[PDB]
Design a protein around this ligand. Structure first.
Ligand code: BNG
Ligand code: BNG
Ligand code: BNG
Ligand code: BNG
Ligand code: BNG
Ligand code: BNG
Ligand code: BNG
Length: 181
């Protein structure tokens, strides 16, 4: 069993963008992919999403993609590519929105999407075991350690706590809806 198409293409894209950032510099890439940072860019619609593709350190991309691979992979395999697409688009938009509102447009990465996937997978498993989707006890512990790392600035993730809460809320809400149905 291997990662599905959405899980795989997201990982490829983040690596390619990370390479571009090392070659050209972070700023050069942000100029093109960042959330709109000037009114002249407000209708460059890719920017409301592409911020999620940028990472700012090895640790940032490593841990984001490990969680994405594991949690996104599981969602895609058990629940379908469509499910993963929607969790990803909604969490990237809302977490990105909240991030720019409080801290400005210069940010990036998949950490908001990961918070959504953590909340989704955990809650789905706690409310609906028969779904086949759940967050293993042991992995709950390491998810919490990753969360704490970002929460208390022990580990730089680009995004702020409120933005991460927004991502988490999306995952929890979708898991809640899916557990009812
Ligand atoms: C602390 C970092 C978070 C924990 C990282 C655990 C990663 C486990 C990934 O396993 C892989 O998942 C793929 C997608 O589901 C499967 O296709 C594949 O068969 C399986 O080998
Ligand atoms: C390979 C990882 C994905 C990179 C990000 C893709 C977004 C590119 C947006 O381009 C835009 C059109 O119209 C114009 C063009 O300037
Ligand atoms: C999905 C994201 C939103 C897509 C809206 C596309 C609107 O196109 C309009 O074109 C002109 C400005 O570019
Ligand atoms: C979410 C819905 C998508 C909104 C699309 C708006 C396209 C606006 C294009 O305007 C182009 O020129 C004028 C700006 O002054
Ligand atoms: C949230 C996941 C990131 C998805 C980014 C999709 C960018 C697609 C750009 O298409 C071409 O641009 C014009
Ligand atoms: C969103 C990722 C982290 C979820 C943390 C939930 C901790 C709850 C631990 O309670 C013990 O087990 C039960 C639910 O598992
Ligand atoms: C700093 C990184 C620490 C990561 C150390 C390895 C963690 C072990 C997790 O194993 C993974 O558990 C999943 C749930 O059972 C399986 O789906 C998957 O196949 C398996 O690979």
């Amino acid at each position: 069993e291997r990662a599905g198409p959405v899980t795989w293409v997201m990982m490829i894209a983040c690596v390619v963008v990370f390479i571009a950032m090392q070659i050209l510099g972070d700023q050069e890439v942000m100029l093109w992919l960042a959330w709109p940072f000037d009114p002249t860019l407000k209708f460059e619609f890719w920017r409301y999403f592409t911020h999620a593709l940028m990472h700012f350190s090895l640790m940032h991309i490593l841990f984001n993609l490990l969680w994405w691979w594991y949690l996104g992979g599981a969602v895609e395999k058990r629940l379908g590519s469509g499910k993963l697409i929607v969790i990803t688009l909604i969490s990237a938009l809302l977490s990105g929105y909240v991030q720019q509102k409080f801290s400005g447009p210069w940010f990036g990465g998949l950490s908001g999407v990961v918070y959504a996937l953590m909340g989704y997978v955990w809650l789905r498993g706690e409310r609906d075991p028969q779904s086949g989707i759940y967050l293993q006890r042991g992995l709950i512990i390491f998810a919490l350690i990753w969360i704490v790392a970002g929460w208390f600035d022990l580990f730089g993730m680009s995004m702020a706590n409120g933005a991460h809460i927004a991502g988490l809320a999306v995952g929890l809400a979708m898991a809640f809806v899916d557990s009812l149905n």
